[PDB]
Design a protein around this ligand. Structure first.
Ligand SMILES: [Ca+2]
Length: 127
């Protein structure tokens, strides 16, 4: 159902190329966020409040299989890594992940460790 990434109250921070940051949540899979060569390419969503998070899609437009992890937090200091695909070699257009029942968080952080990362969209579904 509802895509929290596109809620007005949701803010987004990126480790590079801030000019393209809103491309992560504009509802258009072909508008991309393409990070530069920083060692830790990362995106953090602040949902503004602690919310139910049921599922997450990452639309990956680059050539290489995406290597990534997903972390969540309530206070923004203590993080729980809920998906760890840093060694992934599977090549998919969309990397979907369904969360355990009852997962909540205010912050959702995405770390990308592959090459040619180009993210068309990140969708964070509440139930
Ligand atoms: Ca987009």
């Amino acid at each position: 159902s509802e895509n929290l990434a596109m809620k007005d109250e949701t803010k987004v921070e990126v480790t590079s190329n801030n000019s393209e940051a809103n491309n992560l949540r504009d509802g258009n899979e072909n508008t991309l966020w393409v990070p530069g060569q920083e060692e830790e390419k990362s995106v953090t969503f602040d949902l503004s409040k602690e919310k139910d998070i049921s599922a997450i899609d990452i639309v990956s437009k680059g050539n290489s299989p995406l290597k990534y992890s997903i972390e969540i937090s309530n206070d923004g200091t203590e993080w729980t890594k809920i998906v760890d695909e840093n060694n992934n070699e599977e090549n998919k257009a969309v990397y979907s992940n369904i969360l355990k029942s009852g997962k909540i968080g205010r912050f959702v952080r995405f770390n990308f460790n592959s090459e040619n990362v180009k993210i068309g969209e990140i969708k964070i579904y509440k139930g």
